[PDB]
Design a protein around this nucleic acid. Sequence first.
RNA 1: AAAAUGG
RNA 2: AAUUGAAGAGUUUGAUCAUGGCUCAGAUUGAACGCUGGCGGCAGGCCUAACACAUGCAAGUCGAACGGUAACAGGAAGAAGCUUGCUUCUUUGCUGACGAGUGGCGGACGGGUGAGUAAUGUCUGGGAAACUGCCUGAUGGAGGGGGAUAACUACUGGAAACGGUAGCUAAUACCGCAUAACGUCGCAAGACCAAAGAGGGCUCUUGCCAUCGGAUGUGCCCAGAUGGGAUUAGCUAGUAGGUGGGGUAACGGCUCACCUAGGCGACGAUCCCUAGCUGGUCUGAGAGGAUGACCAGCCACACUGGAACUGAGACACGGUCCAGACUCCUACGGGAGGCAGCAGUGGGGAAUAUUGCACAAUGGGCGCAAGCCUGAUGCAGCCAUGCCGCGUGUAUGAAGAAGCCCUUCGGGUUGUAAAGUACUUUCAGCGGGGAGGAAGGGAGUAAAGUUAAUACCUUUGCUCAUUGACGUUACCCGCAGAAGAAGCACCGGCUAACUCCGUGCCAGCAGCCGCGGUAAUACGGAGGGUGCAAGCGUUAAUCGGAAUUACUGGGCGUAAAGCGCACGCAGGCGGUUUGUUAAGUCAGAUGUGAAAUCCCCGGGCUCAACCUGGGAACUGCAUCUGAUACUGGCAAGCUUGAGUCUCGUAGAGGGGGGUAGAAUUCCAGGUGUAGCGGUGAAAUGCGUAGAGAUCUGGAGGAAUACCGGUGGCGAAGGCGGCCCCCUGGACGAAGACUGACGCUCAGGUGCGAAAGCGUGGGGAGCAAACAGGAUUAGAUACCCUGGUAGUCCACGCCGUAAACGAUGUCGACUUGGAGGUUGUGCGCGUGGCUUCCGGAGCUAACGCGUUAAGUCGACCGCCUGGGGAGUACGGCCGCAAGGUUAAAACUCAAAUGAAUUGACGGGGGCCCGCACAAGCGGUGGAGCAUGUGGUUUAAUUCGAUGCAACGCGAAGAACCUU
RNA 3: GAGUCUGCAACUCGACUCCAUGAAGUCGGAAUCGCUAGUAAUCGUGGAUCAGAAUGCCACGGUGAAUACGUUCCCGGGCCUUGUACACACCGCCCGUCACACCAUGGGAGUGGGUUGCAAAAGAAGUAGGUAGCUUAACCUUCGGGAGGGCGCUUACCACUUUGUGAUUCAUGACUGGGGUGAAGUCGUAACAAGGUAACCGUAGGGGAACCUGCGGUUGGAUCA
RNA 4: GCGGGGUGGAGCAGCCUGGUAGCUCGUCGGGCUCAUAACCCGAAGGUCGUCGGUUCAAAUCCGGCCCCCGCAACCA
RNA 5: GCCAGGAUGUUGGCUUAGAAGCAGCCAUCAUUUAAAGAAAGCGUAAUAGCUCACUGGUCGAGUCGGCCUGCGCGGAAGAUG
RNA 6: AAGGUACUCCGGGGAUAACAGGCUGAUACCGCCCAAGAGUUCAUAUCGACGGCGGUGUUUGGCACCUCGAUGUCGGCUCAUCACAUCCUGGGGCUGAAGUAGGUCCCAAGGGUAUGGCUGUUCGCCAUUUAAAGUGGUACGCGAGCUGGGUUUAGAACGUCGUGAGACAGUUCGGUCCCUAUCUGCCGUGGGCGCUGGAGAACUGAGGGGGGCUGCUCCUAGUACGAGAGGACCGGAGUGGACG
Length: 276
Amino acid sequence: KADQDKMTQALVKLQEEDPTFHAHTDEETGQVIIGGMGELHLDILVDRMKKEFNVECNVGAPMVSYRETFKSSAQVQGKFSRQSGGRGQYGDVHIEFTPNETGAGFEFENAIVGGVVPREYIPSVEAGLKDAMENGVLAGYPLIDVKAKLYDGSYHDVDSSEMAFKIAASLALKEAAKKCDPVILEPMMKVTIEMPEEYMGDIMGDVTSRRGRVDGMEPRGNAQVVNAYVPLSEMFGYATSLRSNTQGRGTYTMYFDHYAEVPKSIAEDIIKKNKG
RNA sequence: AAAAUGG
RNA sequence: AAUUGAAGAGUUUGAUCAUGGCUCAGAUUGAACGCUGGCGGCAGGCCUAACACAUGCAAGUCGAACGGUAACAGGAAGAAGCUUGCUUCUUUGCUGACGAGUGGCGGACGGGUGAGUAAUGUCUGGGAAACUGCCUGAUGGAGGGGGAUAACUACUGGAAACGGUAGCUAAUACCGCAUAACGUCGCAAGACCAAAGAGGGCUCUUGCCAUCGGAUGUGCCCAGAUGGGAUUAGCUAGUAGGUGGGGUAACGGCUCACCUAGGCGACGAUCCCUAGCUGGUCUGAGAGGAUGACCAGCCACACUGGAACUGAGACACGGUCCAGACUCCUACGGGAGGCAGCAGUGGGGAAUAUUGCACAAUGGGCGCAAGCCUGAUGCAGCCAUGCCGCGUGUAUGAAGAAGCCCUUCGGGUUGUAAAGUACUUUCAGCGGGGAGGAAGGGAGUAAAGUUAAUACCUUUGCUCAUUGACGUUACCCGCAGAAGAAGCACCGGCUAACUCCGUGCCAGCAGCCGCGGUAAUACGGAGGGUGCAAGCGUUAAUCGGAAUUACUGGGCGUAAAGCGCACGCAGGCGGUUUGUUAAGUCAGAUGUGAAAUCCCCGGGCUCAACCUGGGAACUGCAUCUGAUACUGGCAAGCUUGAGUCUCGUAGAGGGGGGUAGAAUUCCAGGUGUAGCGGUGAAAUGCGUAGAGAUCUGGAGGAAUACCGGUGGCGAAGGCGGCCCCCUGGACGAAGACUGACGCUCAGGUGCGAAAGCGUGGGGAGCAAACAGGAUUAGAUACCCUGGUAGUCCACGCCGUAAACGAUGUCGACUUGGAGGUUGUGCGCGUGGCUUCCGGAGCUAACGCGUUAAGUCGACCGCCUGGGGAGUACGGCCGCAAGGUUAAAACUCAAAUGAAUUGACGGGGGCCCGCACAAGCGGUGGAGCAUGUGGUUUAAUUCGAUGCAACGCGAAGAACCUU
RNA sequence: GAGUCUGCAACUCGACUCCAUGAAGUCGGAAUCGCUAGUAAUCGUGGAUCAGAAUGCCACGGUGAAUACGUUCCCGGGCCUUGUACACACCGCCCGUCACACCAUGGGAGUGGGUUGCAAAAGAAGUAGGUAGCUUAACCUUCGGGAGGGCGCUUACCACUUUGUGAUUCAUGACUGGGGUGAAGUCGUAACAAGGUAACCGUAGGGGAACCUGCGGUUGGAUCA
RNA sequence: GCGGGGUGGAGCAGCCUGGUAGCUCGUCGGGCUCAUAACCCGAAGGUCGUCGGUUCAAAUCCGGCCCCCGCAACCA
RNA sequence: GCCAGGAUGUUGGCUUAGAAGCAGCCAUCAUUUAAAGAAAGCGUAAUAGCUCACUGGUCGAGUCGGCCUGCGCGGAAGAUG
RNA sequence: AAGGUACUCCGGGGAUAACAGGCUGAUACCGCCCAAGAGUUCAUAUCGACGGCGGUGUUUGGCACCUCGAUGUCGGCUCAUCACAUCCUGGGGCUGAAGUAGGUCCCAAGGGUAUGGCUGUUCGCCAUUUAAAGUGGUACGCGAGCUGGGUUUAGAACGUCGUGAGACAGUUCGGUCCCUAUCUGCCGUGGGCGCUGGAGAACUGAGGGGGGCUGCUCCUAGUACGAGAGGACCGGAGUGGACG
Ligand SMILES: [K+]
Ligand SMILES: [K+]
Ligand SMILES: [K+]
Ligand SMILES: [K+]
Ligand SMILES: [K+]
Ligand SMILES: [K+]
Ligand SMILES: [K+]
Ligand SMILES: [K+]
Ligand SMILES: [K+]
Ligand SMILES: [K+]
Ligand SMILES: [K+]
Ligand SMILES: [K+]
Ligand SMILES: [K+]
Ligand SMILES: [K+]
Ligand SMILES: [K+]
Ligand SMILES: [K+]
Ligand SMILES: [K+]
Ligand SMILES: [K+]
Ligand SMILES: [K+]
Ligand SMILES: [K+]
Ligand SMILES: [K+]
Ligand SMILES: [K+]
Ligand SMILES: [K+]
Ligand SMILES: [K+]
Ligand SMILES: [K+]
Ligand SMILES: [K+]
Ligand SMILES: [K+]
Ligand SMILES: [K+]
Ligand SMILES: [K+]
Ligand SMILES: [K+]
Ligand SMILES: [K+]
Ligand SMILES: [K+]
Ligand SMILES: [K+]
Ligand SMILES: [K+]
Ligand SMILES: [Mg+2]
Ligand SMILES: [Mg+2]
Ligand SMILES: [Mg+2]
Ligand SMILES: [Mg+2]
Ligand SMILES: [Mg+2]
Ligand SMILES: [Mg+2]
Ligand SMILES: [Mg+2]
Ligand SMILES: [Mg+2]
Ligand SMILES: [Mg+2]
Ligand SMILES: [Mg+2]
Ligand SMILES: [Mg+2]
Ligand SMILES: [Mg+2]
Ligand SMILES: [Mg+2]
Ligand SMILES: [Mg+2]
Ligand SMILES: [Mg+2]
Ligand SMILES: [Mg+2]
Ligand SMILES: [Mg+2]
Ligand SMILES: [Mg+2]
Ligand SMILES: [Mg+2]
Ligand SMILES: [Mg+2]
Ligand SMILES: [Mg+2]
Ligand SMILES: [Mg+2]
Ligand SMILES: [Mg+2]
Ligand SMILES: [Mg+2]
Ligand SMILES: [Mg+2]
Ligand SMILES: [Mg+2]
Ligand SMILES: [Mg+2]
Ligand SMILES: [Mg+2]
Ligand SMILES: [Mg+2]
Ligand SMILES: [Mg+2]
Ligand SMILES: [Mg+2]
Ligand SMILES: [Mg+2]
Ligand SMILES: [Mg+2]
Ligand SMILES: [Mg+2]
Ligand SMILES: [Mg+2]
Ligand SMILES: [Mg+2]
Ligand SMILES: [Mg+2]
Ligand SMILES: [Mg+2]
Ligand SMILES: [Mg+2]
Ligand SMILES: [Mg+2]
Ligand SMILES: [Mg+2]
Ligand SMILES: [Mg+2]
Ligand SMILES: [Mg+2]
Ligand SMILES: [Mg+2]
Ligand SMILES: [Mg+2]
Ligand SMILES: [Mg+2]
Ligand SMILES: [Mg+2]
Ligand SMILES: [Mg+2]
Ligand SMILES: [Mg+2]
Ligand SMILES: [Mg+2]
Ligand SMILES: [Mg+2]
Ligand SMILES: [Mg+2]
Ligand SMILES: [Mg+2]
Ligand SMILES: [Mg+2]
Ligand SMILES: [Mg+2]
Ligand SMILES: [Mg+2]
Ligand SMILES: [Mg+2]
Ligand SMILES: [Mg+2]
Ligand SMILES: [Mg+2]
Ligand SMILES: [Mg+2]
Ligand SMILES: [Mg+2]
Ligand SMILES: [Mg+2]
Ligand SMILES: [Mg+2]
Ligand SMILES: [Mg+2]
Ligand SMILES: [Mg+2]
Ligand SMILES: [Mg+2]
Ligand SMILES: [Mg+2]
Ligand SMILES: [Mg+2]
Ligand SMILES: [Mg+2]
Ligand SMILES: [Mg+2]
């Protein structure tokens, strides 16, 4: 970490030395990601750090930011009552959690009937859910693609507090996760690979090996272009492979697409990792 | 006799 | 004439007064940053890395010291193509000159930096033991010789740097000899010591040597002053002194030997941390506080550590030697170098300039002079960095235009603002004139002086050409045309300056108080305004406001602050009288206190900034001459303060020993019979193994009813039956005696409740701990039944309490009243002590009030917002418990005192109500009506919700109503 | 089951009648309400609303009690006084442990630096002293030498450097102590009223915590009719 | 290997000796209070680990199967 | 053994990014024939391509694979020789 | 009518345990058969479910045959010797083998095959090497060769159990290792006789023993191969480690 501060300075200098060098700390992962136009390029930079900058470093695969979503729908109740004398803290909310349309995120519905939960406490309930959803409901990753319907609740004239209702809301989400079976999501990436038709088969074979799907192929100029969607984690190291397959005559451009459920095996591994 | 508390 | 000088505000509360912190308005800067940007003058400009430095430059000069001649520019001579009379080519230091060398002088100045340094520094004032190139005064001398040596030559070693060997040579280079005295040595007699020539035409000029002066510079000494820390109190063996010897220009432990045992320090030594000092600068009414950039003086340092050499002067920025780290060269053997001179580069940093020009002037080195050298200096460049002056137009202009903003849509505001019209043109721009900084120096020419000389030289006049980096100088003049020239911050209060719109505890703002949750003068934008202006804001920084460290000029009953009390050393302070001294003090004088700056009066730049003449001031210090009241010293006194003695009085004053009565407990026995004991109510407990109760005898410990008291005694803490023994203090009466013998007191020392600790005793009662029983949601409590340490004694330790009057001690003074207690004189006096109340005065108020918290004086202790914290760490003390001394970071905008109006109280008093009591009839249970909640529903419309919603809005939903 | 009436229309969803049927209920847990006389209690009657639709509301008469000793207690209100740390005013204020996060700081086996004391070692260059040897322009000379000097060597002083052992200062250290700041956490309620056991001071013992208990002290406690 | 357990939500009875589910707390409804706690009144909730066997009948007895404890697990 | 042919509606359809005999899933055909699978393989992203089955020619006598049984073979690595 | 004895003692047993041997082979280890699958496709490059068949003697065991008128037992040291189920070096097939480097299987036993830290350790983990740090058998090779740390006498203590004496597949500190080699074997070294008359030399070679390891650099050649990164075979030369 003494060389970490030096690493910052080293990366700054390296960026000045080479425009193609791009240093960027991924906020979600909290890991600095070094971008290069080639493996050898990055290698030389790292070697330079070790010597010129005198910064000992070890390269690694960028961590992937995953998300969670309830795979099942279940109505749940969250009750929080803490009254032992004087001003207490009562709050009960019955919230129905249902898998939302992928990408629709959170679609909270206030279906409170009979004004069981007073209007003033309603926003707190929702806000409390949102905060709890941001926290991991399965492994620790932000819960997305879920719909919470507060159909029923309970309140006390004195004990009930907005914060109590936020607590009750969070409690509901917890028990919902136990019944709604959240699943980990992985960020899919749309990759556009262009190469001579001679290597087309090999490229598509690589994508399938990664786990990605070939969207389709299309003729451009002289080099065929294959559209595909590959997981970010799997996409790592594609550059070298592409050049190897195409004899350094292949180019690819990857962009984020959506979040797909991590393979049950992979999901299990992620949960294990997050657990410890 | 007992007789706490009240973001 | 040298003065003219002094503002507050916001924020603790429901409100108030006080206390107290925080914040703000001002001024200032080597500034930085952001935004903006016409011009000029003057000035300033690496605060950081005493970090590392590429390149050039910053110290040379002299041929009137000398051998020479490397050049070159000539001359003469001789050869030459032979301009047939010049040219060429050679020779000749031959001359003008001059490379290199010897020599002399300078290089110790000038320029840079502030690392080190808390005094071998600086500043002020004194002093004896010195030295001093160049300059200047006076008096003498200046004779006659010698031996070298560079350059040079040959040779030779090295990559280079740098050399080696042999030969030759000069001097104002070097050494004898003579000379030797207002010199040195010595008591004296005696003895001893120097020199250089050069230049012009015998003379003049310059230089040389000896001595004594002058000036100047420099060295040295002493006293006072010059940061912080005691959570640094001891320090020191050349150490302190002496003596002798040596050493220095000189005094000196400067050095050495020997001898003695000193020296320094609470008036701060030693050690630690920080730091160049000063004249000055900034702030301040001042006193202070802060600071030491530029300018001037002084000191210190020059890659780091160290040393000497030369010299008048250095332990030497651009010298030497050694070591070290760096950089560079190398043939690997060895070499070379030092920007804290100027400019400049890299690095560091928020941030600080051009590898300019000229020696025209001033000043310096060398020279006879001419001249040469000078990054000193004079100037130019960049930079709004500051200061100062000026400009960006000026009059007219209602059309009160458009257009913007706002509006009650009437209008208002921008705003005479703009258009429009009439003028002016600073400055910029273009053109053309034009100072002054310039003195001198160089030619002649003249007279005089000098001399043998109308020579040469010197002096003063005279005459003729001639010297400006800045520079396109200032300044003046002319020409075209308002043309080419305004921005920045702010408008909730403080604080001068308000609306609209957008946003909606979000975004945001903010020095403080706070502002923002849908009518934001507080955010953001717009319109309008306010303040400043080529600047305006922000940040950092200092002082002020802050009387908030209070010398001037504050506090301590309750706000922070009186040591628990006392004794007492050092220290501070001290009644009254005479004489004496003159230390302080006061007066006058004299020397000094650099210049600059500041101040006053002036002068000069068109003004101002800026520059300059004179004065004032420098508040201080030394010395001399005076004054003598007060303070001090000395001497003699006096009695009034203080003290002693004679006599008597009161007292729970202390220490020791003895004794009495009451009660509790226990033990033994008698009588007697079922309870006792305890509580709010109980229970545990005790009792038929005879309790409790009652009576008798005995044992032991502790404390002394009543008297008894706003009583008494004691420094305080404390002290209570009676008796004796030992002992301290206080007070009164009337005399005598002493003669200021006093007061306070850092440090120090002693005393010091209760609890606690050590050792050895004692132990009735009481009772931390502990146990059980209750109480309670729980009850580690309060209550009950038991019960150990301890409480008691001896000796030792601890050293603290709301150790309180939350009020230090001593002295004097300033209306009264009612009491207590204890003397004393003759009902009326007069002392000591004490309680309550109260006047003036004082106090924020409460209160204090002759026992002051009034009015003053002496000395001491202590305080400087609330927390953190009387804590940590260190020291000291302790057996331990702990005590004592005593921080910081961090955090908050308060904390606090007294009093006021409420409210409230399981505070008090006085009243009252179907409040309770005394009664009567009900509700809660059933069925049903009705309202409500909830749940259900396509919808079950909406509102009402503790008392004070729920047969409520609804005094009447089949449709309508709805 | 059979009707009546009002009304466009009585299924949802009217009142009423007739016949039949004949539920719970045998006096109401804890708790709780009204009423002091023409009152309660009970008995009928009328009215508004309104087509129709009262056990409600509003109003009218009939009959018609019991009990009040009193202020000990409960609750509320008024007035006077007193304490107060309360002021959207006791539904006030407010203390500490514990949980979590963050910040500064103390201790800590130690670890790495700076500075420095003491005791030694060391000895470049230079300067001074001595002189194994070597060498020598100027002076002297008996002409051989001599005087004197230089070099070398040696000694003293001393920089770099080295070693041991302390002191001090700074940084860092598993873990740990207390402090502060958070946020509607948990546990109680210690203080402020006599705060419900007056509080507080010193000391000692005990206890999850605020604290409790003993001993002595202070008033900076209320109360007193 | 030898023993003891597995019963309303929690901790405990009942088993021995078949018929014949208790106690305290918690929970729920009503009350008290401004409200909460405390307090008062009323009520619900184990078919007895998991099956099999026996018996007219099984928490009870027998035997597995799982669970959770205790003890033993040695000497060359 | 060898020389040939080895197909046509038709890439059967669906699905498949693509899937044409040869990913998978449904089919499962018909046609010209001597005969030629809605394909037994290799192959391709899919294609294509290379076979094969099937069949015709050539060749001129046996040929092919099960059953029962005799005897052998592999499976079969160790420490003094 | 219960216990302790490690303070112990006597008579007996290999009728009966602990050690080593034996028998056995459950277990262990090694190999094979079938092939569901995995491997983009594709059982068999590599791997392999559900099941099946063997081999070794190799762990943990079973049995109690040898030894109780005694067969010393963990680990280390010294010294070895064999097997091959091969760790390195040699040869080869396949590969999901571009090269380099691997994977897997076959052949091969000539030689070679760490030092330290910690622990009694074997082992293991760790540090740093190496071409490699092989796996087993040999009374878990080797105490009439050494050690004596472990373990199992008598002393003592802790935890624990027990009323206690004492005890523990707990721990802790301390605590006597004898033997002059007759025979076999082995390393050396002589005497006798023989080999056909005696004697002095020089030999032939049946037979036996020893030895046999390997790194790195350079060249080939930055050549083949690879888009690059990298980087050879084959062949040649030099210089080391260990050992003799
Ligand atoms: K104030
Ligand atoms: K300095
Ligand atoms: K000295
Ligand atoms: K002396
Ligand atoms: K000053
Ligand atoms: K120095
Ligand atoms: K000189
Ligand atoms: K000049
Ligand atoms: K004062
Ligand atoms: K004194
Ligand atoms: K006097
Ligand atoms: K006792
Ligand atoms: K005092
Ligand atoms: K503070
Ligand atoms: K009822
Ligand atoms: K109806
Ligand atoms: K009606
Ligand atoms: K009151
Ligand atoms: K800490
Ligand atoms: K430390
Ligand atoms: K209390
Ligand atoms: K106490
Ligand atoms: K026995
Ligand atoms: K096999
Ligand atoms: K395959
Ligand atoms: K045996
Ligand atoms: K192979
Ligand atoms: K081998
Ligand atoms: K072996
Ligand atoms: K054995
Ligand atoms: K052994
Ligand atoms: K043996
Ligand atoms: K032996
Ligand atoms: K034998
Ligand atoms: Mg010259
Ligand atoms: Mg001379
Ligand atoms: Mg002489
Ligand atoms: Mg300094
Ligand atoms: Mg002032
Ligand atoms: Mg000298
Ligand atoms: Mg110099
Ligand atoms: Mg220099
Ligand atoms: Mg410079
Ligand atoms: Mg920088
Ligand atoms: Mg020059
Ligand atoms: Mg205003
Ligand atoms: Mg608004
Ligand atoms: Mg300021
Ligand atoms: Mg002040
Ligand atoms: Mg004050
Ligand atoms: Mg106070
Ligand atoms: Mg106070
Ligand atoms: Mg006092
Ligand atoms: Mg005193
Ligand atoms: Mg005087
Ligand atoms: Mg002056
Ligand atoms: Mg006097
Ligand atoms: Mg007496
Ligand atoms: Mg008294
Ligand atoms: Mg005591
Ligand atoms: Mg005692
Ligand atoms: Mg008692
Ligand atoms: Mg008691
Ligand atoms: Mg005190
Ligand atoms: Mg007292
Ligand atoms: Mg006090
Ligand atoms: Mg009074
Ligand atoms: Mg303390
Ligand atoms: Mg202390
Ligand atoms: Mg009812
Ligand atoms: Mg009503
Ligand atoms: Mg309707
Ligand atoms: Mg009244
Ligand atoms: Mg620390
Ligand atoms: Mg030396
Ligand atoms: Mg309390
Ligand atoms: Mg109390
Ligand atoms: Mg109190
Ligand atoms: Mg207690
Ligand atoms: Mg066979
Ligand atoms: Mg064999
Ligand atoms: Mg034993
Ligand atoms: Mg025996
Ligand atoms: Mg046997
Ligand atoms: Mg036998
Ligand atoms: Mg055996
Ligand atoms: Mg045997
Ligand atoms: Mg298997
Ligand atoms: Mg066996
Ligand atoms: Mg047998
Ligand atoms: Mg035998
Ligand atoms: Mg093999
Ligand atoms: Mg072998
Ligand atoms: Mg072999
Ligand atoms: Mg061989
Ligand atoms: Mg090892
Ligand atoms: Mg063995
Ligand atoms: Mg072995
Ligand atoms: Mg032996
Ligand atoms: Mg043996
Ligand atoms: Mg042993
Ligand atoms: Mg052989
Ligand atoms: Mg061999
Ligand atoms: Mg060898």
